[PDB]
Amino acid sequence: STQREYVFIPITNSITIDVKITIGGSDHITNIDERGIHNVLVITGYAVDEKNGRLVPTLDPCDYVKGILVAGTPQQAQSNDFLTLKLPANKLYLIRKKGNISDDLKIYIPYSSPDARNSMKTKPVSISDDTIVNNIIKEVFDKIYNITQKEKVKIEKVKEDIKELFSYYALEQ
């Protein structure tokens, strides 16, 4: 069938070995076609744990994690960590929609049990300091989207939204 992996886009670097499929199929939800990114996905009520980044659940409607959607299984390290779920492709709040939906998808989101040990307060984060933008454009946007450097020289066009689009929330304690 069709399964997707939620690669959130923080300013952390702990997302190196995070896929068990590079492309595998011929269907990525997030795309780039000479205008920018597409189908960026937002999950509210979740704060990443960038110190070993994982989607921690808070019940706050004002948190949000934005990321890209790729296809595949987690790592061969699964079954305890990710919050996998099967959604009918209409439960997805996709920013910059361009295509259509498969009408049902399997999503894996790198999830962490809240660890109810501290008041899990959080703080918003914006992706600045293009250094980290540059290194993530190699880390993910050449490792997943090797379509870079094949046609896409307007990386600064994409780098623009990377510096703008993928804001998120993190506990930062």
Partner 1 sequence: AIDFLVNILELIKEKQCNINLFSAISLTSIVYNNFGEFLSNNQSYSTNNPLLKYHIIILNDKNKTKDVEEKRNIFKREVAELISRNFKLDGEKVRNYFDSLKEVLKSLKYTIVDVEITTRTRALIGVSTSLGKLIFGSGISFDPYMNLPYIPASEIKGIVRSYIEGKLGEQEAEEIFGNEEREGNVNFTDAYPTRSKDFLFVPDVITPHYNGKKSEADAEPRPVIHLTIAPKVTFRFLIYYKREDVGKPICDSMPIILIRGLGARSSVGYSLFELRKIEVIKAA
Partner 2 sequence: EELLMSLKLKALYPLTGGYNRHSINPFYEELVRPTEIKGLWRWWNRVLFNTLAYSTKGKLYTYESIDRLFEDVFGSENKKSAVRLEVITDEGNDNRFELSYVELDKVIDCLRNYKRKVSLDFIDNTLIAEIEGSTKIPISFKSNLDIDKIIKDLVHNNKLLSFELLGFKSVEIDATKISDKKILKEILRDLITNYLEYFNIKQEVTFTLNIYLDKSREHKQNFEDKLKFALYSLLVFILLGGIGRKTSRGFGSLSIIDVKCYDNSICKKIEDLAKNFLKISSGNELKSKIESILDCIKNSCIDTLYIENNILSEIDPKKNVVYFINSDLFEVKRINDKEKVLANIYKAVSSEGCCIKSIITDKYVRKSFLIAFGGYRKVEKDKGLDIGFIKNYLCETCETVSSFNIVDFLLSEGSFMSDYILQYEHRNSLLRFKLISDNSNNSYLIGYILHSSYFKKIDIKYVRCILEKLTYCVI
Partner 3 sequence: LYEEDYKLALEAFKKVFNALTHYGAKQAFRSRARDLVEEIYNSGFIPTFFYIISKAELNSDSLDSLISLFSSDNAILRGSDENVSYSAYLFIILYYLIKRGIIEQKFLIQALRCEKTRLDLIDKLYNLAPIISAKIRTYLLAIKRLSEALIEAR
Residue with tokens 């790729």: 70
Bridge partner residues of 55 (DSSP): 111
Q: Which is nearer to a second copy, 9 or 16 (CB)?
A: 9
Among 37, 127, 133, 140, binds partner 3 (CB under 8 A): 127
- Written as one letter, the residue type at 16 is T
Give the chain's count of helices (H) and strands (E): 2, 10
Residues 47-66, mask of contacts with partner 3 (x by CB under 8 A): -------------xxx-x--
Which region among 78-86, 103-111, 147-155, 159-167 touches partner 3 (by CB under 8 A)?
A: 159-167
Exposed, middle or buried: residue 1 (CB in 10 Å: 0-12, 13-18, 19+)? exposed
Q: How far apart are CA 15 and CA 13, in angstroms?
A: 6
Which region among 58-66, 125-133, 136-144, 160-168 touches a second copy (by CB under 8 A)?
A: 58-66
Q: How far apart are CA 125 and CA 29, in angstroms?
A: 24
Residue 95: contacted member of partner 3, partner 2, a second copy, none (CB under 5 to 8 Å, by partner type):
partner 3
Q: Which is nearer to a second copy, 58 or 136 (CB)?
A: 58
Binding residues for partner 3, per CB under 8 A?
42, 44, 60-62, 64, 93-97, 124, 126-128, 163-164, 167
